[PDB]
Amino acid sequence: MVLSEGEWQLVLHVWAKVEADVAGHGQDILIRLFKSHPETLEKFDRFKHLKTEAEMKASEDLKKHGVTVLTALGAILKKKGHHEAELKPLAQSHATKHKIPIKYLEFISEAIIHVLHSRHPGDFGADAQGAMNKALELFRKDIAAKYKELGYQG
Numbered sequence: 003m004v005l006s007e008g009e010w011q012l013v014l015h016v017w018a019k020v021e022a023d024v025a026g027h028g029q030d031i032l033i034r035l036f037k038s039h040p041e042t043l044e045k046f047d048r049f050k051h052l053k054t055e056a057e058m059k060a061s062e063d064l065k066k067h068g069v070t071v072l073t074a075l076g077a078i079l080k081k082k083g084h085h086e087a088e089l090k091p092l093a094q095s096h097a098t099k100h101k102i103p104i105k106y107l108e109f110i111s112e113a114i115i116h117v118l119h120s121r122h123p124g125d126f127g128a129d130a131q132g133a134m135n136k137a138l139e140l141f142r143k144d145i146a147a148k149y150k151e152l153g154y155q156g
């Protein structure tokens with residue numbers, strides 16, 4: 003809810019490692035999300051027809067959209083919680099157009115933490131993970147607040 007400057011630096015130190023291969027991370031994150039939570043795939047009319055992990059990895063539009071995800075997320079994270087202006091277009095389209103429940107943001111957050119671990123075994127330790135979780139929690143909480151502002155979600 004408030005992160006220390008140290009936790010923010012951990013988050014941004016890790017994020018520079020994402021920005022080194024945004025496509026790879028975005029792809030992996032989306033695939034982890036769809037594998038571990040197939041219900042989220044159904045929300046993508048563009049991808050719902052991708053079934054094996056092998057198909058997802060070969061979809062360049064899935065990879066493109068991972069880039070879309072992560073660059074939007076990275077913009078937010080670089081604001082270190084001063085992200086109201088960035089969240090509202092995101093909350094607006096995910097509440098009202100995509101109709102994404104906040105719970106699915108929790109799933110993709112777990113997918114992010116997981117993919118960060120498999121792509122950075124020695125870099126993503128307990129501290130950075132604690133920090134990244136706080137930052138994604140703050141993100142989720144502020145998105146949820148923005149949902150209710152738009153009059154949405156339980």
Ligand code: HEM
Nearest residue numbers: 042045046048070071074075092095096100102106107110
């Ligand atoms: C870190 C969390 C997330 C970020 C930063 C993010 C960001 C974005 C962005 C930038 C777009 C493109 C513009 C827009 O439509 O708003 C998008 C589209 C979309 N998002 Fe997300 N999203 C996140 C989580 C999720 C989750 C978990 C789901 C569904 C389970 C979802 C469902 C969708 C859908 C269906 C679209 C339209 C996709 C398409 O055009 O094929 N989002 N998202």
